[PDB]
């Protein structure tokens, strides 16, 4: 309302994405979605550079496999860009999270329209959930949708 969040920053070109000093040693997990053939490493740091990898932790106190986990990805609305095919997710769509020790199975429940200042979606609700932040477009700054998914099971990597 009175104060607008600075989370509306434009994600630099794809050149910085493939030329950026990738911090692999900083990766704490990975995300995979066969339905939309999307795969990206999870970056612990919620910096602008980290957001170029397509996935970065929103809250520092997030615990994979427990509570409401959330990641933000930069989408320019151009096929081939990060989080662009995320909006193609359908209800009940399976999503897998890979922690350095295990893998958690999540099921997409749907999508909704929320503002970029809505930190509530990322707040812990005493339940195991996942929240992905995807921007509608680089031209649409009115509102952005957020995809939500619930935990359906857990399976360790043997």
């Amino acid at each position: 309302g009175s104060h607008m969040d600075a989370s509306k920053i434009d994600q630099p070109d794809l050149a910085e994405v493939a030329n950026a000093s990738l911090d692999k040693k900083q990766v704490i997990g990975r995300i995979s979605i066969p339905s939309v053939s999307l795969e990206l490493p999870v970056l612990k740091s919620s910096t602008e550079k980290n957001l170029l990898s397509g996935a970065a932790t929103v809250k520092e106190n997030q615990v994979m496999g427990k509570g409401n986990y959330a990641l933000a990805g930069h989408n320019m609305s151009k096929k081939g860009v990060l989080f662009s095919d995320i909006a193609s997710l359908k209800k009940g769509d399976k999503i897998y999270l890979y922690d350095n020790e295990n893998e958690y199975e999540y099921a997409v429940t749907g999508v909704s329209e929320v503002t970029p200042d809505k930190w509530e979606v990322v707040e812990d609700h005493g339940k195991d959930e996942i929240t992905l932040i995807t921007c509608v477009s680089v031209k649409d700054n009115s509102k952005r949708y957020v995809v939500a998914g619930d935990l359906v099971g857990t399976k360790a990597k043997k």
Binding site: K8, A56, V58, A72, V122, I133, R144
Partner: peptide, 4 residues
């Protein structure tokens, strides 16, 4: 509610 960070970037994106």
């Amino acid at each position: 509610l960070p970037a994106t």
